[PDB]
Structures are given as structure tokens and as C-alpha cells.
Design a binder for this molecule. Structure first.
Ligand code: MG
Ligand code: MG
Ligand code: MG
Ligand code: MG
Ligand code: MG
Ligand code: MG
Ligand code: MG
Ligand code: MG
Ligand code: MG
Ligand code: MG
Ligand code: MG
Ligand code: MG
Ligand code: MG
Ligand code: MG
Ligand code: MG
Ligand code: MG
Lengths: 101, 120, 94, 95, 18, 41, 55, 50, 140
RNA sequence: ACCCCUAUACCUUCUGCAUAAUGAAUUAACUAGAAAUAACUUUGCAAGGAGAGCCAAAGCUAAGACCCCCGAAACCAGACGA
RNA sequence: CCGAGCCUGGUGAUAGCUGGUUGUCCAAGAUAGAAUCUUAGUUCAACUUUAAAUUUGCCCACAGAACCCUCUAAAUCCCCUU
RNA sequence: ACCUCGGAGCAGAACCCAACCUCCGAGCAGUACAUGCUAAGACUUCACCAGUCAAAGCGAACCUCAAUUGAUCCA
């Protein structure tokens, strides 16, 4: 997925990450970074030296139960599942830019 | 009655105009086909379904490498309307033992031997 | 007022359908793919006498593996450990 | 076929099967050909010869006759001069 | 057979007009 | 034997610990439910 | 009627019947009921073999 | 008719497609269409069909 | 009556707790509640495809609105953004159109520049510079 | 909350039912798969098994697993009724 | 409520006919015909399911499968390689 | 009106293939009396029942035809 992130906010991603809670992580694959009065675009990704996005793992949980019901009429066809997918919450801490333009 | 169709061999005889339209060289032809299923076998006869199963094109848009030999060529001629055939070309050599892990099919048919993720 | 006899798309009198630009273009591009397939199926590499037995050994080995799998069928082994550790059902403080 | 009899609660046997067929202990049933003694004046010697044969039954027919008979008729018999003594066992049969 | 080069080899009533 | 040495641990055998050999007790099939009901075979 | 460890007996039986079969024999081990099941008929060979081992 | 056949400008011909079984079109066509070349439909003849 | 059912109430409640917000007799009567809850759960399962499709349609509508505000058309904007190797999806494109209008105007200007370069290329076959916001970056 | 978008109740019966084909107001309770021959699996013992009888050219013994509910118009016997 | 009364019993009469046949989840799974007082049913084939044993199964190439009149078609059978 | 059996077409080139579809027929006849006896291997009207061909051998001289038909019990 592509996320429009800024500093201080939260992102919910729908799977596990094999990280502990509180771990700080560098979010690579930055394709746009914009401030007031200017914007930098990648083709398709910006350079490693240019942008640096940091995110900390804040919560490892599961989703609310999702019902998967299958039904067909006049066929005695009825099935039901409940699924809870894993989820990780990431807090974006900082987005730094370097003069290497 | 609907039956299997036998194709005249004059269909599979390229002209110099065809050799100009496509980049194939009638001398030293290509060893391997890349074949990709691009059409479902539903509403198609059971023999075409079986031939697709034998060729291993059960999954659509998944490339499979095959020989350029008459037996498999007849097999492909049976279901030629459901698939795409391209030559497999090797810009570098064949994959070696120490470069077998880092390879990529790299559509346009060029099986590249080294696969970095950096711009040139 | 514009009424078609029963089951529009079957029978003697049917609702007419006409071919748009989409359908013609789709047919033409699939025909182009088929023509390129005809081209690439025109230059074989081993002329059908040179391919007489170049894979016989490997196909024989594959079927030998298939037969080995088909004949290596037997009930699994039975261990004292499972029967004895079913006793753990009533393991109290110790 | 009287799976349970009103007197003993036992399975019964169809006696037509016993009157018409012979069971070898291996599991094979032997019968006679139909019409083997009817209108022999319109039949060729080859047809009559193949009609005089004692032949084996189908797998389906064998299971049907086993169902229709009781296990008494499946025991191993040791008659004195049985002409079918050598046929009660199978030899050189593989699976 | 009818699809074979040797088809119609046993044709004789075209020879005997009788 | 190692089996009685294993039993030296292994809390005592009682009527709350017994269990048949797997494969001996085939499970009964009942005509209740979606799969085995509505026509019952 | 095996008594003691049965895996050594399985090893010995496999080593004995591998040359005769050309492949390792298909075998099931039952420790709780100390029996050894082998795929195929080898009754006379195994009887002679065990007699020679002295059982 | 011959002149129209030779100076036809599109590269896709009923004869070619039907005889090569392009797109698997023989499941819709008839065994007689290999010789009728799309010019005949039942008892009707199309003289502009090429 | 050996072993009749005792906890039928809990099964009835298992079905009925998903009908409390219904209307009519189907929020309390099991014989109708069960049918309507079955239909509701089937709808819940099938609604995921529609949610994806409808959210994409909303993104497309919003991007069309913003592009027409800048004078562009949606196909032109999407195609030329692809041709500039900037791979932003409809979601983030609508996000920027709503919350970063300066960035969206820059994106529309870049797409228009690439479109003009494509027209010039179709006119002149390159010869010389084949455009500046052309010249795709190669990877190996 | 509604307004927006998507969506032709269920069961049975059928080639095919939203069907304007059946059945059903609704709640509670009651209300419908019973077993053999022979096989399969798991034990015991083993040229023998089985607690008499029976089977046996690896068999025999034991266990497990397995075959619904409602409905005619009828027929007969004996009573009871002008 | 008499084309042959009513009640009880035989009687849980019989019904190839209609209706109904109750927890969860997963998996494989759509049939050429023959006979039948039989075509509203059943039995054997066929298809389908499970478990076992073993080795080939499908796709296929040359060569090959009377004639006769007038054509004799799309195709088929057989079939190593693959 | 038909119900069993055979030949042709439909059903064009292995097999099969419906119709209250189109056409022909059959329910015998003629000749030896080894038209004796046995016995590999096969075919098969889509099941079964029925039906079909046949080497070698023992004996003895040196079979036509398309259908031409009827199970069991019982007498
Ligand atoms: Mg209508
Ligand atoms: Mg129900
Ligand atoms: Mg109807
Ligand atoms: Mg409908
Ligand atoms: Mg209705
Ligand atoms: Mg009705
Ligand atoms: Mg009603
Ligand atoms: Mg009666
Ligand atoms: Mg009467
Ligand atoms: Mg009076
Ligand atoms: Mg009843
Ligand atoms: Mg009805
Ligand atoms: Mg499935
Ligand atoms: Mg009936
Ligand atoms: Mg047959
Ligand atoms: Mg002879």
C-alpha cells in the first residue's frame, strides 16, 4: 500500500511484522516528499540519502471478527467462518530531508 | 458436427516478410519457447483443456518454458488460440551455478543473468 | 411496444445485436497474437529425428519415482510414548 | 430373503441357488449352460459342445450367490472321491 | 483406406463393362 | 525395559486415564446436520 | 513376539532383505504390541534367518 | 470479384481465419465454411463478402 | 424423555443478538430472524468487493474533479503520470487533491508538460532531445 | 436514524421458480435411520483359534462401524343399531 | 356424511404416489445402454466414492484399416517419441 | 397401428448410435450322416443370459444359406 504520512500520526497495517512493540524502524520506499512551497518526486522512488522516514511499532493486535457466510437457496448450502487478521500500528516519528539534492 | 481441427502445414511456414516483421532468424532458431496462457479453457473442448493441463498452463499469465521440438510444437498447435508464444533469449549466457539465485525473466523475453535493484 | 418473442436471445426471432468498435478491436488484437504464434511455431530446432530419445532416461526415472511413491504405502509406526503419555491427563501438583 | 427368521433369528438360504450352482472353496461358482438339453436337433456340434460345459460365474453373480447362501455352504468339505476336489484351491494366482 | 495413396487399388468393375 | 521406567513417572493409572487404541473405535455416523441430513443418504 | 528394543530388529531385517529385494523393505514397527510388519511374503526366509540367529 | 479479392486491404480474411482455426473459430463456424469462405449463409449468397 | 435439549435458549440468543437492530417481528421471532440474519451475513461477506470498487470509483471521481479544476482530463493525467515514472495510486492522488492542492497542481503541470512532450515527439520523432520529462530511468 | 450505492424471502419440487407452483400467523414443548452376509480397522492367540457345538492351504476369536416418519380409498372376523 | 351401516379387533393393513426427515467444518463428486405387465419403479452395465496392489495411462508419427457404381466431407481407429 | 429376428439408408472413411423415420425381408429350405470326440487362443449386438470363430490332438475319408427363433420349472 501507499500511505500519505506526516509526522506524529498513526498507520494500521493488516499483518504481523516480526518486531517488538516500541521498536524504531526506517520506512524505505519513499516516492514523494513535500513541504510548504516545494515537492520532491521519485522515479519511482526517492534516493536513500534524500529522505528518512522513521516509524515506531506501537501496538500488535488482531482485528475485530469478520464473518464469512456462504449461502445458496434450495441447495442446503450454508457455511460460516469467523476470521481475525493480525494488525500492527505504526506511529510515524520523523521525516528528515538532507541537502544531497 | 464439431470435431478437432487439423491445420495445414502451409500455415506454419514463415515468409521473408514474416522474418522481417518479427525478429526471428530461420537459421539457428530459438531453443526454448516462453508460453503464457491468456485465454480460459472454459467453453473449450476437453482435449484443449487436457492439452493445457499437460503443457502446465493451468494458471493464466504465468510464463512456462518449453522446448522448440516438433512434439511439443504439435501440442502447442492444438491450443495455439489460448496462449502466447515468444522466444526465450539469453542476453548473457545460460544461468550458471553461482548466478542461478539472482535471475529474472525480465519480460520482452530476456532472461537476465544478474538482477540488481539499482538504476544504471 | 418494442416486444421480442420469448427468451430474447434464443429461438427463431431474437433481439438483434450489433458489433461495436470495442469488439472489432479486441478481435483484431487477438488475431495479431495468433498470427505471431503461427510465426514462432514455424522454425523448430530438432527436426523430429534428433528428438527420438533425448528425454527417455529422464521420463523413465520420473515414472520410477512415481511407482516408488505408489508402492511405498504402509501403516505408520506406533510408539509406546503416545500411549504412555496419555496418562498425563491427570497430572496434579508434584 | 429372510435375513432374520421368525423362529431362530437366523439368516436363511435360497434353495434354488443350491439346486443350480456349485461353490468351490476358493470363492468360484460353477453353473451349467442354459438350453444345454433343449432342441439339440437345431444346434451344431460346436454349439452343443460349448453348451455341455461347466462354466464360472461373474464377480457380481458370485457375490449375489454368496449373499443368497449361508456360510454352511462355504465351509471346506473333505469328501471321499469328490470330482471337484482339485478345483477347491487356487494356484499361481497373483493379486 | 480412403485417405491413403493406395486408395481404389481394387477397382475392377470399371474394367469389366459387362 | 524402558516402558516401566517411563511409568515410574507418569501419574498413576486409574479409571480417569483409560483410552482405547486409535483405530479400534470407529466413530458412528448420525443423520443430523447439513452434511449427513436432509436426505440421510 | 519381539522382546527388547525392536528398532535393532528392524535394522537387521532391512539389512537382510535389502539384497533379496533390490530395495529397502517397506516396514511398520509396533512397539506397544511388539510386532514387526513387512510388506511382501518372506516367511520362510525370516524363519530360517531367525533360526540361524538362534531364536 | 477477383480484383476485389486481390486488392482487399485488410489483412484479416475469413478464409485465412477459418482454415487456420484462428481464435478457435471452428466452434462457431461449420465444416462447409472451409469451402464457402464466408460467402454463403444457408441458401443465401453474398456477392460483396470477398 | 431421556436427554432432551436443555440449553436451547442460548442458541436462540446466539442467533437473536444479531437481529436486535432489525425492524418488525424479525428482531424477536427466531423463525424470521434466522433467515434475515443469514441474508445479512451473506451481504456482509459480499460487500467487501463492492467496498473496494466503490472506493476506487470515488477516488476516480475526485481526481477527475481536481484535474478539471486544473484544466486537465483524468485519462491524460493518469497516463502521463505513469509515463513520468511517478507511481501514485488513485487513493493518494485524491488525498493530495483534497489536502495538498499545491502538490496536485504541480502534478497536473507535470502531466501536461509530459503530454505536450508526447505530442512534440509524435510530431518530430525525437530529433534531438526527445523531451526532458521523458527519458525513463533504466534499472538492472 | 433516514436520505447515497448494492441486493428478485425460505423450503420443497423441477430442464429450469422472485415466481402469480407447495407449505408456513407466531411462540413454547414434542416430533422422523432400527440389522445381517461379506469386507475394513484395532487387540489376543497362532497351524491353530474359540469357555463343548464351529471354522481353518494364516487362520480364528473379540470389539468398533450399518439400512427413517406421517398419510389412503380397501379387505376380513366378531359385536351394536328399525 | 350407504354402489353398501356403525364400532372394535386383525392393524404400526399396504402405498413404485405426495409431504417431511433436526449440531459444526472440510473434501471427492453430473450418468453410453440392456431387460423388465416396463418406461412415476427396479436389476445389471456406465459414471461416481473409499481403501489396497501393481505398472503404465493420456497426448500421439511414419507405416497401416475391400470395395462400386458418381462425388466420398469435417473427421476416426491404430500409434513410438514427447 | 405396432411389440421377436435379419439386410440397406439416415449413420460418407475403427466401433456404436434414435424416430408411430424411409425401404426390403424371416418364423424355412436343400445335401451328407465323422452334422464324431476333444482342445490352445479369441470375438461378442454396449450388462447378464444367450450367441460366434478356431489351431493342435484322438479317430475317419484320402456343410450351403441372412434372419429361419423361445430360458426356467414342469411333462
Ligand atoms: Mg419473453
Ligand atoms: Mg430443514
Ligand atoms: Mg414443469
Ligand atoms: Mg431465476
Ligand atoms: Mg412460491
Ligand atoms: Mg403440485
Ligand atoms: Mg396456506
Ligand atoms: Mg388389493
Ligand atoms: Mg367387497
Ligand atoms: Mg318404529
Ligand atoms: Mg406408510
Ligand atoms: Mg408435489
Ligand atoms: Mg470440491
Ligand atoms: Mg412406477
Ligand atoms: Mg459384450
Ligand atoms: Mg483339426
Amino acid at each position: 500500500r501507499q500511505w500519505k504520512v506526516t509526522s506524529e500520526d498513526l498507520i494500521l497495517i493488516g499483518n504481523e511484522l516480526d518486531l517488538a512493540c516500541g521498536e524504531r524502524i526506517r520506512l524505505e520506499k519513499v516516492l514523494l516528499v513535500g513541504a510548504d512551497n516545494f515537492t520532491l518526486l521519485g522515479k519511482p522512488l526517492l534516493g536513500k540519502d534524500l529522505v528518512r522516514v522513521e516509524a515506531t511499532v506501537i501496538e500488535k493486535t488482531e482485528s475485530w471478527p469478520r464473518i464469512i457466510m456462504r449461502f445458496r437457496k434450495r441447495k442446503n448450502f450454508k457455511k460460516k467462518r469467523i476470521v481475525t487478521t493480525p494488525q500492527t500500528v505504526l506511529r510515524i516519528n520523523s521525516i528528515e530531508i538532507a541537502p544531497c539534492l | 458436427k464439431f470435431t478437432r481441427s487439423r491445420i495445414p502445414e502451409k500455415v506454419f511456414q514463415a515468409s521473408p516478410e514474416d522474418h522481417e516483421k518479427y525478429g526471428g532468424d530461420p537459421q539457428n532458431p530459438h531453443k526454448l519457447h516462453i508460453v503464457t496462457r491468456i485465454k480460459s479453457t472454459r467453453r473449450r473442448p476437453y482435449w484443449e483443456k487436457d492439452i493445457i493441463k499437460m503443457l502446465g498452463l493451468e494458471k493464466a499469465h504465468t510464463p512456462q518454458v518449453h522446448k522448440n521440438i516438433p512434439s511439443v510444437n504439435a501440442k502447442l498447435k492444438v491450443v495455439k488460440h489460448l496462449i502466447r508464444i515468444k522466444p526465450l533469449k539469453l542476453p548473457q549466457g545460460l544461468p550458471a551455478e553461482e548466478n542461478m539465485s539472482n535471475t529474472c525473466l525480465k519480460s520482452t523475453g530476456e532472461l537476465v543473468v544478474q538482477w540488481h535493484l539499482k538504476p544504471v | 411496444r418494442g416486444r421480442i418473442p420469448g427468451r430474447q436471445w434464443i429461438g427463431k426471432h431474437r433481439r438483434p445485436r450489433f458489433v461495436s468498435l470495442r469488439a472489432k478491436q479486441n478481435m483484431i488484437r487477438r488475431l495479431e497474437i495468433e498470427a505471431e504464434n503461427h510465426y514462432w511455431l514455424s522454425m523448430p530446432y530438432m527436426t523430429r529425428e534428433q528428438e527420438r530419445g533425448h528425454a527417455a532416461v529422464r521420463r523413465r526415472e520420473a515414472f520410477e519415482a512415481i511407482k516408488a511413491a505408489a508402492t511405498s504405502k504402509f501403516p505408520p509406526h506406533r510408539f509406546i510414548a503416545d500411549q504412555l503419555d496419555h496418562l498425563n491427563v491427570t497430572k496434579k501438583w508434584s | 430373503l429372510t435375513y432374520f427368521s421368525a423362529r431362530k433369528g437366523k439368516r436363511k438360504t435360497v434353495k434354488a441357488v443350491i439346486d443350480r450352482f456349485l461353490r468351490l472353496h476358493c470363492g468360484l461358482w460353477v453353473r451349467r449352460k442354459a438350453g444345454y438339453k433343449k432342441k439339440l436337433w437345431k444346434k451344431t456340434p460346436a454349439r452343443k459342445k460349448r453348451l455341455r460345459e461347466f462354466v464360472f460365474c461373474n464377480k457380481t453373480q458370485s457375490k449375489l450367490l454368496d449373499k443368497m447362501t449361508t456360510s454352511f455352504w462355504k465351509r471346506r468339505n473333505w469328501y471321499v472321491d469328490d470330482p471337484y476336489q482339485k478345483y477347491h484351491d487356487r494356484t499361481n494366482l497373483k493379486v | 483406406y480412403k485417405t491413403k495413396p493406395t486408395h481404389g487399388i481394387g477397382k475392377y468393375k470399371h474394367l469389366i463393362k459387362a | 525395559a524402558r516402558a516401566l521406567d517411563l511409568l515410574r513417572g507418569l501419574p498413576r493409572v486409574s479409571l480417569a486415564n483409560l483410552k482405547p487404541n486409535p483405530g479400534s473405535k470407529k466413530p458412528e455416523r448420525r443423520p443430523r446436520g447439513r452434511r449427513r441430513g436432509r436426505k440421510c443418504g | 513376539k519381539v522382546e527388547g528394543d525392536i528398532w535393532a530388529l528392524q535394522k537387521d531385517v532391512e539389512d537382510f532383505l535389502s539384497p533379496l529385494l533390490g530395495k529397502t523393505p517397506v516396514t511398520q514397527v509396533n512397539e506397544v504390541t511388539g510386532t514387526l510388519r513387512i510388506k511382501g511374503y518372506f516367511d520362510q526366509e525370516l524363519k530360517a534367518w531367525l533360526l540361524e540367529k538362534g531364536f | 470479384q477477383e480484383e476485389r479479392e486481390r486488392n482487399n486491404q485488410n489483412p484479416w480474411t475469413f478464409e485465412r481465419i477459418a482454415t487456420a482455426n484462428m481464435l478457435g473459430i471452428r466452434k462457431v463456424l461449420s465444416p462447409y465454411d472451409l469451402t464457402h469462405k464466408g460467402k454463403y449463409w444457408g441458401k443465401f449468397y453474398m456477392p460483396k463478402r470477398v | 424423555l431421556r436427554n432432551r435439549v436443555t440449553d436451547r435458549y442460548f442458541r436462540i440468543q446466539e442467533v437473536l443478538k444479531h437481529a436486535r437492530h432489525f425492524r418488525g417481528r424479525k428482531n424477536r421471532c427466531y423463525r424470521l430472524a434466522v433467515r434475515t440474519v443469514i441474508r445479512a451475513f451473506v451481504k456482509c461477506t459480499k460487500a467487501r468487493y463492492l467496498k473496494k470498487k466503490n472506493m476506487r470509483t470515488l477516488w476516480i471521481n475526485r481526481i477527475t474533479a481536481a484535474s478539471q479544476e486544473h484544466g486537465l482530463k483524468y485519462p491524460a493525467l493518469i497516463g502521463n503520470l505513469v509515463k513520468c515514472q511517478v507511481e501514485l495510486n488513485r487513493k493518494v492522488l485524491a488525498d493530495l487533491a483534497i489536502y495538498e492542492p499545491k502538490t496536485f497542481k504541480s502534478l497536473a503541470a507535470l502531466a501536461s508538460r509530459r503530454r505536450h512532450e508526447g505530442f512534440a515527439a509524435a510530431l518530430g520523432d525525437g530529433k534531438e532531445p526527445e523531451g526532458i520529462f521523458s527519458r525513463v530511468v533504466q534499472y538492472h
